[PDB]
Amino acid sequence: ASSINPWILTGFADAEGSFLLRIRKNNKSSVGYSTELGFQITLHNKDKSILENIQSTWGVGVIANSGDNAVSLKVTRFEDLKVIIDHFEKYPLITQKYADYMLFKQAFNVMENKEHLTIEGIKELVRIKAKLNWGLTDELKKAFPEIISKERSLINKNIPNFKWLAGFTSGDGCFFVNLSKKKTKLGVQVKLVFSISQHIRDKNLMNSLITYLGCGYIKKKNKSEFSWLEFVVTKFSDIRDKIIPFFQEYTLIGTKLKDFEDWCKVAKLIEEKKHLTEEGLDEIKKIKLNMNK
DNA sequence: GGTTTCCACTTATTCGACCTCTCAG
DNA sequence: CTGAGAGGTCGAATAAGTGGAAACC
Ligand SMILES: [Ca+2]
Ligand SMILES: [Ca+2]
Ligand SMILES: [Ca+2]
Ligand SMILES: [Ca+2]
């Protein structure tokens, strides 16, 4: 296993990490509840190597299958959480997930004091959990109606450095070869697309990518009640002169690195105008077939 | 006996990956 | 004709989370 640059790791955690606070009804526990605090990343099987590298970097965490297609790294051994905290104190998250991290830290402090072994400490964990991720289940709310949770901190941080973006892109980004039929004797337009997807809660961060990368635009997307954003670059001069040199310098991790490598092969053919030939179109369709999914 | 840690594997829905058309220069 | 956006779809590699019991103090 290889170690991962810490800012790349934090950017990847902003895109792929989740904090965890289990408060479980437990007939064997003196206070009727047991707890489990943690941090986890779930990826496709093909990216198991990233999880082994993170495990090797931090020296913590257990890896297991997550269903038929995915694999997780989960850190819940309590002493190992100190490694997680030590990392994110030095290399802080910048999406809204930073607020979940802060709630995770509060829960750590409660459990370090063994307060979770008292009913009052369980109550304090429920207060913290109420704003963490999806919040309290209805079943738990019914158990602790008394609870009043402090409102959730809205995060508005800047991108700390390019390595963070390399990690974030390795998680939530997409390098895509768009083919769209036209009329023309050739008949197909080849267009390279770079995009990053994110929940609308981080509108500010996503909007800032345009200024930070000096190209792109934001698309708002919806699906029933859910909404998210796409930062998108389609202009070939920006792909060739901004996006490609950026990730050539700030190296992606995992399978997305291979997608980016194939994507650049297509950019080369496009720069040589080989995409407006039948022989070059063959080559590009071959590269596209071998990418992503 | 009580508590912590790990593995199996899911639900919810935020991602990624995928497609097609318009129209300015 | 070509490029750059416009305007989408869609499935789960989504983000998040639960049941059971091994493992331990
Ligand atoms: Ca993400
Ligand atoms: Ca994931
Ligand atoms: Ca991903
Ligand atoms: Ca088992």
mmCIF file of C-alpha atoms (C1' of nucleotides) and ligand atoms in Angstrom:
data_model
loop_
_atom_site.group_PDB
_atom_site.id
_atom_site.type_symbol
_atom_site.label_atom_id
_atom_site.label_comp_id
_atom_site.label_asym_id
_atom_site.label_seq_id
_atom_site.Cartn_x
_atom_site.Cartn_y
_atom_site.Cartn_z
ATOM 1 C CA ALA A 1 0.000 0.000 0.000
ATOM 2 C CA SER A 2 1.006 3.586 -0.788
ATOM 3 C CA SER A 3 0.414 6.596 1.422
ATOM 4 C CA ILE A 4 -1.869 9.424 0.296
ATOM 5 C CA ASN A 5 -1.104 13.120 0.460
ATOM 6 C CA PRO A 6 -3.102 14.515 3.410
ATOM 7 C CA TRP A 7 -4.844 17.309 1.521
ATOM 8 C CA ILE A 8 -5.760 14.871 -1.237
ATOM 9 C CA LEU A 9 -7.113 12.649 1.541
ATOM 10 C CA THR A 10 -9.216 15.468 3.018
ATOM 11 C CA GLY A 11 -10.596 16.409 -0.392
ATOM 12 C CA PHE A 12 -11.489 12.772 -0.948
ATOM 13 C CA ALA A 13 -13.143 12.655 2.475
ATOM 14 C CA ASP A 14 -15.193 15.751 1.593
ATOM 15 C CA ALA A 15 -16.411 13.829 -1.457
ATOM 16 C CA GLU A 16 -16.576 10.259 -0.123
ATOM 17 C CA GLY A 17 -16.490 10.252 3.700
ATOM 18 C CA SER A 18 -19.326 9.870 6.181
ATOM 19 C CA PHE A 19 -19.341 10.261 9.925
ATOM 20 C CA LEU A 20 -21.337 7.800 11.993
ATOM 21 C CA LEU A 21 -22.984 7.937 15.419
ATOM 22 C CA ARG A 22 -25.015 4.845 16.268
ATOM 23 C CA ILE A 23 -27.325 5.036 19.296
ATOM 24 C CA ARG A 24 -28.862 1.574 19.490
ATOM 25 C CA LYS A 25 -31.512 0.190 21.800
ATOM 26 C CA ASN A 26 -29.600 -2.519 23.669
ATOM 27 C CA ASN A 27 -31.264 -4.782 26.260
ATOM 28 C CA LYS A 28 -27.834 -5.737 27.640
ATOM 29 C CA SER A 29 -26.668 -2.159 28.318
ATOM 30 C CA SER A 30 -27.109 -0.669 31.775
ATOM 31 C CA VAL A 31 -28.796 2.443 30.306
ATOM 32 C CA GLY A 32 -30.718 0.538 27.632
ATOM 33 C CA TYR A 33 -28.595 1.957 24.784
ATOM 34 C CA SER A 34 -25.166 1.299 23.330
ATOM 35 C CA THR A 35 -23.216 3.528 20.990
ATOM 36 C CA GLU A 36 -20.670 3.399 18.184
ATOM 37 C CA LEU A 37 -18.844 6.445 16.804
ATOM 38 C CA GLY A 38 -16.973 6.507 13.519
ATOM 39 C CA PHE A 39 -15.883 7.579 10.054
ATOM 40 C CA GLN A 40 -16.347 5.531 6.885
ATOM 41 C CA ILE A 41 -15.844 5.579 3.102
ATOM 42 C CA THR A 42 -17.705 3.306 0.681
ATOM 43 C CA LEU A 43 -16.425 2.851 -2.891
ATOM 44 C CA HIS A 44 -16.789 0.511 -5.826
ATOM 45 C CA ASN A 45 -14.857 -2.766 -5.567
ATOM 46 C CA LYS A 46 -12.485 -1.457 -8.245
ATOM 47 C CA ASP A 47 -11.293 1.218 -5.788
ATOM 48 C CA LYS A 48 -10.497 -1.137 -2.925
ATOM 49 C CA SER A 49 -6.877 -0.068 -3.422
ATOM 50 C CA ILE A 50 -7.691 3.499 -2.310
ATOM 51 C CA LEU A 51 -9.196 2.138 0.892
ATOM 52 C CA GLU A 52 -6.092 0.059 1.571
ATOM 53 C CA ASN A 53 -3.959 3.147 0.973
ATOM 54 C CA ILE A 54 -5.998 5.239 3.384
ATOM 55 C CA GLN A 55 -5.853 2.414 5.931
ATOM 56 C CA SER A 56 -2.065 2.347 5.494
ATOM 57 C CA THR A 57 -1.777 6.147 5.686
ATOM 58 C CA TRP A 58 -3.738 6.436 8.927
ATOM 59 C CA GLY A 59 -2.954 3.016 10.390
ATOM 60 C CA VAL A 60 -6.631 2.562 11.344
ATOM 61 C CA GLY A 61 -9.824 1.196 9.899
ATOM 62 C CA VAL A 62 -11.321 -2.123 8.796
ATOM 63 C CA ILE A 63 -12.218 -3.039 5.206
ATOM 64 C CA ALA A 64 -15.189 -5.206 4.291
ATOM 65 C CA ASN A 65 -17.471 -5.881 1.378
ATOM 66 C CA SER A 66 -20.468 -3.553 1.170
ATOM 67 C CA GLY A 67 -22.882 -5.681 -0.829
ATOM 68 C CA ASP A 68 -21.999 -7.257 -4.162
ATOM 69 C CA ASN A 69 -20.470 -4.210 -5.862
ATOM 70 C CA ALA A 70 -18.850 -2.070 -3.179
ATOM 71 C CA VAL A 71 -16.356 -2.101 -0.307
ATOM 72 C CA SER A 72 -16.053 0.060 2.792
ATOM 73 C CA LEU A 73 -13.351 1.358 5.089
ATOM 74 C CA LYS A 74 -14.893 1.929 8.530
ATOM 75 C CA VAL A 75 -13.095 3.406 11.539
ATOM 76 C CA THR A 76 -15.061 2.905 14.783
ATOM 77 C CA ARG A 77 -12.498 1.525 17.242
ATOM 78 C CA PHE A 78 -12.605 4.354 19.762
ATOM 79 C CA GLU A 79 -8.851 4.936 20.236
ATOM 80 C CA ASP A 80 -8.390 4.989 16.451
ATOM 81 C CA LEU A 81 -10.753 7.946 16.206
ATOM 82 C CA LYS A 82 -7.934 10.083 17.647
ATOM 83 C CA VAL A 83 -6.070 9.570 14.378
ATOM 84 C CA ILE A 84 -9.132 10.803 12.442
ATOM 85 C CA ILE A 85 -9.418 13.884 14.646
ATOM 86 C CA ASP A 86 -5.693 14.577 14.451
ATOM 87 C CA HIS A 87 -5.916 14.498 10.650
ATOM 88 C CA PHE A 88 -8.954 16.714 10.222
ATOM 89 C CA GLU A 89 -7.763 19.221 12.819
ATOM 90 C CA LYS A 90 -4.673 19.727 10.654
ATOM 91 C CA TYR A 91 -6.357 19.321 7.240
ATOM 92 C CA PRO A 92 -9.943 20.480 7.750
ATOM 93 C CA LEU A 93 -12.913 19.558 5.598
ATOM 94 C CA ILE A 94 -14.567 22.400 3.740
ATOM 95 C CA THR A 95 -17.965 21.148 2.563
ATOM 96 C CA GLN A 96 -21.019 21.071 4.827
ATOM 97 C CA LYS A 97 -19.565 17.744 5.988
ATOM 98 C CA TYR A 98 -17.277 19.860 8.192
ATOM 99 C CA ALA A 99 -20.318 20.466 10.440
ATOM 100 C CA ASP A 100 -20.823 16.710 10.692
ATOM 101 C CA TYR A 101 -17.159 16.359 11.641
ATOM 102 C CA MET A 102 -17.640 18.932 14.412
ATOM 103 C CA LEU A 103 -20.634 17.000 15.735
ATOM 104 C CA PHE A 104 -18.563 13.804 15.564
ATOM 105 C CA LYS A 105 -15.894 15.553 17.644
ATOM 106 C CA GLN A 106 -18.454 16.539 20.274
ATOM 107 C CA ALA A 107 -19.635 12.953 20.461
ATOM 108 C CA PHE A 108 -16.010 11.807 20.832
ATOM 109 C CA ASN A 109 -15.590 14.107 23.848
ATOM 110 C CA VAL A 110 -18.723 12.717 25.516
ATOM 111 C CA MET A 111 -17.621 9.115 24.997
ATOM 112 C CA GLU A 112 -14.034 9.800 26.038
ATOM 113 C CA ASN A 113 -15.498 10.883 29.382
ATOM 114 C CA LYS A 114 -17.495 7.614 29.516
ATOM 115 C CA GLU A 115 -20.688 9.681 29.768
ATOM 116 C CA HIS A 116 -22.354 7.395 27.193
ATOM 117 C CA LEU A 117 -22.532 4.838 30.024
ATOM 118 C CA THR A 118 -25.072 7.105 31.779
ATOM 119 C CA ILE A 119 -28.564 8.046 30.634
ATOM 120 C CA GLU A 120 -27.615 11.747 30.677
ATOM 121 C CA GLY A 121 -24.748 11.106 28.285
ATOM 122 C CA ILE A 122 -26.983 9.137 25.947
ATOM 123 C CA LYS A 123 -29.236 12.202 25.994
ATOM 124 C CA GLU A 124 -26.307 14.441 25.058
ATOM 125 C CA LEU A 125 -25.371 12.121 22.175
ATOM 126 C CA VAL A 126 -28.964 12.262 20.929
ATOM 127 C CA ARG A 127 -28.746 16.044 20.983
ATOM 128 C CA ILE A 128 -25.563 15.890 18.893
ATOM 129 C CA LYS A 129 -26.925 13.198 16.576
ATOM 130 C CA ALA A 130 -30.066 15.264 15.882
ATOM 131 C CA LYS A 131 -28.116 17.537 13.469
ATOM 132 C CA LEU A 132 -25.664 14.879 12.238
ATOM 133 C CA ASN A 133 -26.311 13.657 8.687
ATOM 134 C CA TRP A 134 -29.911 12.385 8.498
ATOM 135 C CA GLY A 135 -30.627 13.132 12.192
ATOM 136 C CA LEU A 136 -32.753 11.149 14.598
ATOM 137 C CA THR A 137 -35.021 8.362 13.496
ATOM 138 C CA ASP A 138 -38.685 8.751 14.437
ATOM 139 C CA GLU A 139 -38.135 5.796 16.792
ATOM 140 C CA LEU A 140 -35.361 7.660 18.615
ATOM 141 C CA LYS A 141 -37.184 11.016 18.652
ATOM 142 C CA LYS A 142 -40.112 9.295 20.352
ATOM 143 C CA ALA A 143 -37.653 8.014 22.981
ATOM 144 C CA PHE A 144 -36.134 11.474 23.645
ATOM 145 C CA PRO A 145 -38.778 14.150 22.954
ATOM 146 C CA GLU A 146 -37.270 16.371 25.649
ATOM 147 C CA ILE A 147 -34.230 16.995 23.453
ATOM 148 C CA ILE A 148 -33.499 20.446 22.076
ATOM 149 C CA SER A 149 -30.733 20.477 19.469
ATOM 150 C CA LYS A 150 -28.667 23.554 18.702
ATOM 151 C CA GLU A 151 -29.191 24.690 15.091
ATOM 152 C CA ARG A 152 -26.665 23.420 12.565
ATOM 153 C CA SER A 153 -23.646 25.507 11.634
ATOM 154 C CA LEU A 154 -23.635 26.579 7.995
ATOM 155 C CA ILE A 155 -20.139 26.156 6.566
ATOM 156 C CA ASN A 156 -18.699 28.645 4.072
ATOM 157 C CA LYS A 157 -14.980 27.918 3.589
ATOM 158 C CA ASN A 158 -12.691 28.458 0.621
ATOM 159 C CA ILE A 159 -10.760 25.775 -1.263
ATOM 160 C CA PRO A 160 -7.515 25.446 0.744
ATOM 161 C CA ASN A 161 -5.248 24.315 -2.120
ATOM 162 C CA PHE A 162 -5.268 22.412 -5.381
ATOM 163 C CA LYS A 163 -4.472 19.071 -3.763
ATOM 164 C CA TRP A 164 -7.814 19.266 -1.928
ATOM 165 C CA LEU A 165 -9.558 19.667 -5.290
ATOM 166 C CA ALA A 166 -7.660 16.689 -6.720
ATOM 167 C CA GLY A 167 -9.008 14.553 -3.873
ATOM 168 C CA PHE A 168 -12.540 15.987 -4.119
ATOM 169 C CA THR A 169 -12.544 15.408 -7.893
ATOM 170 C CA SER A 170 -11.331 11.820 -7.385
ATOM 171 C CA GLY A 171 -14.537 11.299 -5.430
ATOM 172 C CA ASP A 172 -17.338 13.367 -6.988
ATOM 173 C CA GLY A 173 -15.942 14.283 -10.386
ATOM 174 C CA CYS A 174 -16.517 12.906 -13.883
ATOM 175 C CA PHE A 175 -14.366 12.828 -17.049
ATOM 176 C CA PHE A 176 -16.687 12.090 -19.948
ATOM 177 C CA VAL A 177 -16.400 11.745 -23.728
ATOM 178 C CA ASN A 178 -19.726 13.048 -25.031
ATOM 179 C CA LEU A 179 -20.803 11.744 -28.437
ATOM 180 C CA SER A 180 -23.928 13.290 -29.970
ATOM 181 C CA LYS A 181 -25.192 12.551 -33.459
ATOM 182 C CA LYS A 182 -25.391 15.495 -35.803
ATOM 183 C CA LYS A 183 -26.494 15.572 -39.453
ATOM 184 C CA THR A 184 -23.095 16.054 -41.240
ATOM 185 C CA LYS A 185 -21.077 13.634 -43.389
ATOM 186 C CA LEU A 186 -19.084 12.730 -40.265
ATOM 187 C CA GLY A 187 -22.329 12.552 -38.273
ATOM 188 C CA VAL A 188 -21.039 12.641 -34.660
ATOM 189 C CA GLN A 189 -19.774 15.487 -32.476
ATOM 190 C CA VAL A 190 -17.018 14.550 -30.029
ATOM 191 C CA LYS A 191 -16.989 16.868 -27.015
ATOM 192 C CA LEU A 192 -14.985 16.456 -23.817
ATOM 193 C CA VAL A 193 -16.832 17.189 -20.581
ATOM 194 C CA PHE A 194 -15.441 17.672 -17.078
ATOM 195 C CA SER A 195 -17.949 17.870 -14.247
ATOM 196 C CA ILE A 196 -18.284 17.787 -10.474
ATOM 197 C CA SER A 197 -21.643 16.935 -8.872
ATOM 198 C CA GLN A 198 -22.795 18.089 -5.451
ATOM 199 C CA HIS A 199 -25.858 18.586 -3.272
ATOM 200 C CA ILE A 200 -27.224 22.120 -3.485
ATOM 201 C CA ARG A 201 -26.254 22.754 0.132
ATOM 202 C CA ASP A 202 -22.729 23.521 -1.095
ATOM 203 C CA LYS A 203 -23.858 25.977 -3.769
ATOM 204 C CA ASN A 204 -21.257 28.503 -2.572
ATOM 205 C CA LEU A 205 -18.347 26.085 -2.887
ATOM 206 C CA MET A 206 -19.511 24.811 -6.273
ATOM 207 C CA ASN A 207 -20.008 28.344 -7.621
ATOM 208 C CA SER A 208 -16.461 29.171 -6.459
ATOM 209 C CA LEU A 209 -15.041 26.499 -8.779
ATOM 210 C CA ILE A 210 -15.719 28.799 -11.748
ATOM 211 C CA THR A 211 -13.507 31.487 -10.236
ATOM 212 C CA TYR A 212 -10.988 28.979 -8.881
ATOM 213 C CA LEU A 213 -10.467 27.067 -12.128
ATOM 214 C CA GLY A 214 -11.113 30.049 -14.417
ATOM 215 C CA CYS A 215 -13.654 28.193 -16.571
ATOM 216 C CA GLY A 216 -16.920 26.315 -16.340
ATOM 217 C CA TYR A 217 -20.492 27.023 -15.342
ATOM 218 C CA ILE A 218 -23.084 25.685 -12.910
ATOM 219 C CA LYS A 219 -26.142 23.649 -13.905
ATOM 220 C CA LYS A 220 -28.989 23.158 -11.417
ATOM 221 C CA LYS A 221 -30.648 19.742 -11.613
ATOM 222 C CA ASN A 222 -33.764 18.321 -9.995
ATOM 223 C CA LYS A 223 -35.416 14.935 -9.597
ATOM 224 C CA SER A 224 -38.736 15.089 -7.698
ATOM 225 C CA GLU A 225 -38.018 16.940 -4.430
ATOM 226 C CA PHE A 226 -34.246 16.566 -4.694
ATOM 227 C CA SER A 227 -31.913 19.174 -6.187
ATOM 228 C CA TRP A 228 -28.179 19.252 -6.830
ATOM 229 C CA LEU A 229 -25.626 21.144 -8.906
ATOM 230 C CA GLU A 230 -23.119 20.301 -11.610
ATOM 231 C CA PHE A 231 -19.963 22.313 -12.210
ATOM 232 C CA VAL A 232 -19.343 21.661 -15.924
ATOM 233 C CA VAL A 233 -16.533 22.495 -18.367
ATOM 234 C CA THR A 234 -17.147 21.811 -22.063
ATOM 235 C CA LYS A 235 -15.054 24.431 -23.916
ATOM 236 C CA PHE A 236 -12.155 22.535 -25.492
ATOM 237 C CA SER A 237 -9.653 25.362 -25.000
ATOM 238 C CA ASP A 238 -10.370 25.307 -21.244
ATOM 239 C CA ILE A 239 -10.157 21.488 -21.129
ATOM 240 C CA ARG A 240 -6.832 21.565 -22.996
ATOM 241 C CA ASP A 241 -5.231 24.539 -21.266
ATOM 242 C CA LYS A 242 -6.726 24.515 -17.750
ATOM 243 C CA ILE A 243 -8.352 21.234 -16.679
ATOM 244 C CA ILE A 244 -5.877 18.809 -18.247
ATOM 245 C CA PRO A 245 -2.703 20.586 -16.999
ATOM 246 C CA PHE A 246 -4.251 20.933 -13.498
ATOM 247 C CA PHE A 247 -4.843 17.226 -13.041
ATOM 248 C CA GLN A 248 -1.562 16.342 -14.772
ATOM 249 C CA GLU A 249 0.147 18.190 -11.918
ATOM 250 C CA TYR A 250 -2.234 17.295 -9.060
ATOM 251 C CA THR A 251 -2.632 13.590 -9.493
ATOM 252 C CA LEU A 252 -6.000 11.928 -9.124
ATOM 253 C CA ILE A 253 -6.389 8.717 -7.165
ATOM 254 C CA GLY A 254 -8.320 5.542 -7.856
ATOM 255 C CA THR A 255 -10.111 4.538 -11.013
ATOM 256 C CA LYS A 256 -10.841 8.146 -11.891
ATOM 257 C CA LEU A 257 -7.137 8.564 -12.636
ATOM 258 C CA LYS A 258 -7.480 5.971 -15.389
ATOM 259 C CA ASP A 259 -10.580 7.705 -16.753
ATOM 260 C CA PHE A 260 -8.640 10.977 -16.822
ATOM 261 C CA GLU A 261 -5.704 9.291 -18.605
ATOM 262 C CA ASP A 262 -8.080 7.941 -21.312
ATOM 263 C CA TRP A 263 -9.845 11.326 -21.528
ATOM 264 C CA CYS A 264 -6.512 13.009 -22.258
ATOM 265 C CA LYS A 265 -5.867 10.527 -25.094
ATOM 266 C CA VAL A 266 -9.053 11.827 -26.696
ATOM 267 C CA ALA A 267 -8.048 15.460 -26.139
ATOM 268 C CA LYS A 268 -4.815 14.711 -27.988
ATOM 269 C CA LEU A 269 -6.774 13.368 -30.967
ATOM 270 C CA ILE A 270 -9.068 16.411 -30.818
ATOM 271 C CA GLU A 271 -6.128 18.814 -30.809
ATOM 272 C CA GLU A 272 -4.811 17.046 -33.918
ATOM 273 C CA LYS A 273 -8.318 17.341 -35.424
ATOM 274 C CA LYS A 274 -8.378 13.545 -35.781
ATOM 275 C CA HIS A 275 -11.898 13.582 -34.298
ATOM 276 C CA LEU A 276 -13.162 14.998 -37.590
ATOM 277 C CA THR A 277 -11.975 11.856 -39.421
ATOM 278 C CA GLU A 278 -13.510 8.392 -39.600
ATOM 279 C CA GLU A 279 -10.291 6.720 -38.451
ATOM 280 C CA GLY A 280 -9.988 9.048 -35.464
ATOM 281 C CA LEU A 281 -13.650 8.640 -34.528
ATOM 282 C CA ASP A 282 -13.072 4.852 -34.373
ATOM 283 C CA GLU A 283 -10.207 5.401 -31.982
ATOM 284 C CA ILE A 284 -12.220 7.760 -29.800
ATOM 285 C CA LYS A 285 -15.179 5.379 -29.647
ATOM 286 C CA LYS A 286 -12.764 2.639 -28.592
ATOM 287 C CA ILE A 287 -11.335 4.797 -25.796
ATOM 288 C CA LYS A 288 -14.816 5.859 -24.657
ATOM 289 C CA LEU A 289 -16.004 2.232 -24.509
ATOM 290 C CA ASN A 290 -13.168 1.396 -22.076
ATOM 291 C CA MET A 291 -13.899 4.331 -19.708
ATOM 292 C CA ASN A 292 -15.851 4.857 -16.487
ATOM 293 C CA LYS A 293 -18.635 2.250 -16.212
ATOM 294 C "C1'" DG B 1 -22.198 -8.895 32.778
ATOM 295 C "C1'" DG B 2 -21.892 -5.100 30.311
ATOM 296 C "C1'" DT B 3 -19.507 -2.793 26.342
ATOM 297 C "C1'" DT B 4 -16.986 -2.385 22.187
ATOM 298 C "C1'" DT B 5 -15.782 -3.753 17.548
ATOM 299 C "C1'" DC B 6 -16.448 -5.922 13.478
ATOM 300 C "C1'" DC B 7 -19.008 -8.088 9.326
ATOM 301 C "C1'" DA B 8 -23.170 -8.595 6.374
ATOM 302 C "C1'" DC B 9 -25.793 -5.823 3.599
ATOM 303 C "C1'" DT B 10 -29.387 -2.692 3.359
ATOM 304 C "C1'" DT B 11 -32.179 2.168 2.526
ATOM 305 C "C1'" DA B 12 -32.201 6.825 0.740
ATOM 306 C "C1'" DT B 13 -31.202 9.537 -2.500
ATOM 307 C "C1'" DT B 14 -26.625 12.350 -4.104
ATOM 308 C "C1'" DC B 15 -24.106 11.454 -7.093
ATOM 309 C "C1'" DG B 16 -21.648 10.215 -11.705
ATOM 310 C "C1'" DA B 17 -22.439 8.692 -16.237
ATOM 311 C "C1'" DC B 18 -24.958 8.926 -19.931
ATOM 312 C "C1'" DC B 19 -27.764 11.015 -24.014
ATOM 313 C "C1'" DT B 20 -29.528 14.710 -27.791
ATOM 314 C "C1'" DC B 21 -30.538 18.800 -29.570
ATOM 315 C "C1'" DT B 22 -30.051 24.299 -30.947
ATOM 316 C "C1'" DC B 23 -27.819 27.824 -33.199
ATOM 317 C "C1'" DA B 24 -23.840 31.414 -33.552
ATOM 318 C "C1'" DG B 25 -19.692 32.074 -36.264
ATOM 319 C "C1'" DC C 1 -20.024 22.286 -40.368
ATOM 320 C "C1'" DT C 2 -18.373 22.589 -35.869
ATOM 321 C "C1'" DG C 3 -18.241 23.943 -31.042
ATOM 322 C "C1'" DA C 4 -20.292 25.299 -26.891
ATOM 323 C "C1'" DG C 5 -23.862 25.292 -24.296
ATOM 324 C "C1'" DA C 6 -28.928 23.784 -23.174
ATOM 325 C "C1'" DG C 7 -31.516 20.521 -21.371
ATOM 326 C "C1'" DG C 8 -32.159 16.770 -19.998
ATOM 327 C "C1'" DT C 9 -32.316 10.951 -18.187
ATOM 328 C "C1'" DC C 10 -31.386 7.215 -14.993
ATOM 329 C "C1'" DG C 11 -29.544 3.699 -11.946
ATOM 330 C "C1'" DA C 12 -26.864 2.813 -7.842
ATOM 331 C "C1'" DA C 13 -19.903 2.829 -8.075
ATOM 332 C "C1'" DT C 14 -25.191 7.498 -3.977
ATOM 333 C "C1'" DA C 15 -24.448 9.128 1.431
ATOM 334 C "C1'" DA C 16 -25.865 7.087 5.075
ATOM 335 C "C1'" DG C 17 -27.191 3.638 8.026
ATOM 336 C "C1'" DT C 18 -29.150 -1.182 10.770
ATOM 337 C "C1'" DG C 19 -29.021 -6.365 12.586
ATOM 338 C "C1'" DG C 20 -26.368 -9.715 14.605
ATOM 339 C "C1'" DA C 21 -22.614 -11.543 17.155
ATOM 340 C "C1'" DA C 22 -17.685 -11.814 17.851
ATOM 341 C "C1'" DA C 23 -14.566 -9.924 20.941
ATOM 342 C "C1'" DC C 24 -13.281 -7.918 24.883
ATOM 343 C "C1'" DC C 25 -12.820 -5.696 29.943
HETATM 344 CA CA CA D 1 -19.908 13.158 -2.318
HETATM 345 CA CA CA D 2 -19.170 6.628 -1.695
HETATM 346 CA CA CA D 3 -17.132 8.434 -6.283
HETATM 347 CA CA CA D 4 -21.827 -12.293 11.333
#
